[PDB]
Structure 1
Amino acid sequence: KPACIKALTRIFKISDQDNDGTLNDAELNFFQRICFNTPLAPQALEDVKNVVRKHISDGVADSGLTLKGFLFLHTLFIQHETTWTVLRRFGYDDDLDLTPEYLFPLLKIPPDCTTELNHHAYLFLQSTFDKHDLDRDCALSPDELKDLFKVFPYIPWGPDVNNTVCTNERGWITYQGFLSQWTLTTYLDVQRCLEYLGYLGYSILTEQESQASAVTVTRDKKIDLQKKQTQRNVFRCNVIGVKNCGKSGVLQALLGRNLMRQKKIREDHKSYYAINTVYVYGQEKYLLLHDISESEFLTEAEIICDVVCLVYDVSNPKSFEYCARIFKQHFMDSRIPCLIVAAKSDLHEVKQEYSISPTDFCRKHKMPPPQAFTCNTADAPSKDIFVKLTTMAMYPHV
């Protein structure tokens, strides 16, 4: 029984689309249709409300069904089969748990293909954000996130999510940052995104066969390279360099954060990812950065990307050798574009101990010139390199 109440309470929360605490006639009729194929007459609906009002006082607020009122009607129909109709319609099984078919619809992704949310999927998330942004500040406070996750069986996002997407003045995920996190999750872990969409009741509220009906599968990367044109909107860039060469500073710069703001980031909440929108020649795209920590190996995983960002420290004389090394053993004869970034360029430039200068190296292997970059500036860092990286990802040849 307590398991039954738990499910119905969630089903209520999902059905309350405007998230006001009641099921108005608009939302109530929607619920009846998806469950019982036919809604009730406008005043025959008012008759049911009367039955509620004449038993409990807190069962009907405004002229819409409250949760207590909703749970009350569940008891009335028993003292059956009406409830199980509702439960099964919302993905629950006999054990009152969400079925694998509902939460994990199989979506086999072809090799060298990526996953994006379609336009209607984004719209669903845009409304989803608005429903829980009750303070209208275009950001989700910790309370507004707890509210959003009350349809989730566990907390899906950790405190590092705030160091991955755009946040506001107080570290709260903004409206744009919110969509960036979903864009990010969909790209890296589509099965997790589909699971999360199930918790939000996407498949039901949008009346579609599965959560998978929100994901777009882009074509083979090889075809994009051969046809020299892509339709993708999300591009992944791997950031590679020695330890403490300023990689994390590059990632956080994409989020618009100064170096001084970065020093207040606790390591418990550290993130090796950063995602944001970038405009390339009037086209809006998503740039996805992945901080690759200096390890003994570089597998076939940390090399798959649309563009590589080799970062070295100008105050570190031995740092650029790493860039030259990694480039020569993974990206020298690769169809992946590479951009060298001279990070910490606010510091005094020290002569690199490598055999050849960064400048000449970029000519020997036909790359763009080493880009000067710093996150240690007043206001927010420059988005120049991020436009560059995205541009090279979109047009590898040009």
Structure 2
Amino acid sequence: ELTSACKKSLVRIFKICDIDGDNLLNDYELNLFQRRCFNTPLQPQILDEVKAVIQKNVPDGIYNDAVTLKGFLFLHCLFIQRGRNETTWAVLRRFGYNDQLEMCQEYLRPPLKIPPGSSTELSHRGQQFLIAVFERYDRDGDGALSPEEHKMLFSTCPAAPWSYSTDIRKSCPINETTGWVTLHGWLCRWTLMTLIDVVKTMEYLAYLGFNVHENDSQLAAIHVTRERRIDLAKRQSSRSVYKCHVIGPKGSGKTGMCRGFLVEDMHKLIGKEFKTNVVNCINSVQVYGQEKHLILRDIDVRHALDPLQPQEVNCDVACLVYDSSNPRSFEYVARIYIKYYAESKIPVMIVGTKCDMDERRQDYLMQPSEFCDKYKLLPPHLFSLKTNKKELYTKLATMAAFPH
């Protein structure tokens, strides 16, 4: 008696309303979402009348004095055959469904005007919701999400916003022993998406049930920040998420640098080729007492005469990487800086990798130390994976967070 499309909707709503992740709708959430859909408290007499009917007609419908999914589906299947579809339709409407039982576009994509220069970040409520969601689908409570848990989480979505195996497990911090996405990495992946694709973030937040939980549009999950002068306003809006473009020639070792941002032990990335092309890596660092998220975009390696796109040049901080063991490697960095960054307002940091081996001379006309000295740049940062030092990442974020 229940439509296959209607059942799909009622299932998602059950998962959203299951705030304990125990496959049950206890008294609390039943009353809470009652005001979400009907703006009235659920009077105790009705709830008893509801449970009694479910218990009477449906086995395994009431477990531990709580409504199960099998009983929840029956109740609305009973509502439609008793001439009260408006009760069911009031619930479907609140969780973002229209007359065609499809997610409303105005419910998924609310209008958000982003001024030039402004960035998109997660708000306090947006973070809290994502934290709440995380700990619900962390059934075993190991403080991390398994690929089985990560699938259930986005079962209320058409698909996952990212691959578990080829994205979040390689672009975000994970648990060292289990190899699963921690709470920290969870917030990192959402922070990355929110900055580069806010519309997708809000679209997925609606699917996860942010609108119903927060009793507001997903605009409350997005916090728009921008770099402003010495404004004496009481409402601070300083940035906390910066993006760094990592540009270098082939074999520069800049890829291994990006991945090292995510692991405490970099002694396992020394002699390793990367089979997966991770575009954006992200982690947080402490900058003067404040938490700052840094995104290390691995710009696609090309020839030295090949042009760089404006959207590849324009960033918060440019990290030009060359190989110290390759005499013909620094010439790319010198070529790139002069053409694209020499006359820009973007802070640039030159990094020499693989300094563990003997730093051979560069077959260029100027040496890296002299080149930086000529264009008033900081001395070339010697980076190595055998050292496990992470001052570079903290430095990069600081250059993006501060003048010039």
Please say whether Structure 1 and Structure 2 have the same fold, judged by a TM-score greater than 0.5. Answer: yes
SS at match of 2:312: coil
Equivalent residue for 1:291? Answer: 298
Indicate yes or no: 2:216 matched with 1:216. Answer: no
Indicate yes or no: 2:207 matched with 1:202. Answer: no
Match among 136, 161, 170 for residue 156 of structure 1: 161
The number of aligned residues is 389
Indicate yes or no: 2:322 matched with 1:320. Answer: no
| 2:92 alignment partner AA | L
SS at match of 1:40: coil
Equivalent residue for 2:129? Answer: 124
Structure 2 distance, partners of 1:281, 1:230, is 17
Equivalent residue for 1:394? Answer: 401
Structure 2 distance, partners of 1:322, 1:266, is 22
Equivalent residue for 1:165? Answer: 172
SS at match of 1:285: strand
SS at match of 1:73: helix
Given that 2:269 and 2:385 are in contact with CA atoms closer than 8 Å, whether structure 1 keeps it comes out as no
Where in structure 2 are there 5+ consecutive unaligned residues? Answer: none
Equivalent residue for 2:259? Answer: 252
Map 1:227-246 → 2, pairs under 5 A = 231-246=238-253
Match among 335, 350, 372 for residue 360 of structure 2: 350
| 2:77 alignment partner AA | T
Give the TM-score of the pair, scaled to structure 2. 0.92
Structure 1 distance, partners of 2:377, 2:95, is 54
Indicate yes or no: 2:139 matched with 1:134. Answer: yes
| Structure 1 pair 108–196 and aligned structure 2 pair: CA distance change class (3 A) | same
Structure 1 distance, partners of 2:131, 2:351, is 35
Indicate yes or no: 2:397 matched with 1:369. Answer: no
Match among 102, 106, 115 for residue 101 of structure 1: 106
Aligned-pair CA distance for 1:265: 7.1
Where in structure 1 are there 5+ consecutive unaligned residues? Answer: none
Map 1:15-54 → 2, pairs under 5 A = 15-54=17-56
Structure 1 distance, partners of 2:311, 2:183, is 31
Equivalent residue for 1:189? Answer: 197
Structure 2 distance, partners of 1:104, 1:94, is 18
| Structure 1 pair 263–139 and aligned structure 2 pair: CA distance change class (3 A) | farther
Structure 1 distance, partners of 2:120, 2:237, is 14
Structure 2 distance, partners of 1:225, 1:238, is 27
Match among 178, 188, 202 for residue 186 of structure 2: 178
Structure 2 distance, partners of 1:263, 1:148, is 35
1:46-83 per-position Cα deviation (integer Å, ceiling 9, x unaligned): 22111111111211111211101100101211222211
Instruction: State the superposition RMSD in angstroms.
Output: 1.9
| 1:173 alignment partner AA | V
Structure 2 distance, partners of 1:8, 1:230, is 39
1:348-379 per-position Cα deviation (integer Å, ceiling 9, x unaligned): 211111111111111111111111101234xx
Equivalent residue for 1:280? Answer: 287
| 1:70 alignment partner AA | F
1:175-227 per-position Cα deviation (integer Å, ceiling 9, x unaligned): 1000000000001111111111011111111000x2122111112x4x45999
| Structure 1 pair 218–349 and aligned structure 2 pair: CA distance change class (3 A) | same
Aligned-pair CA distance for 1:230: 7.6
Structure 1 distance, partners of 2:150, 2:89, is 30
Aligned-pair CA distance for 1:138: 1.3
Structure 1 distance, partners of 2:126, 2:180, is 23
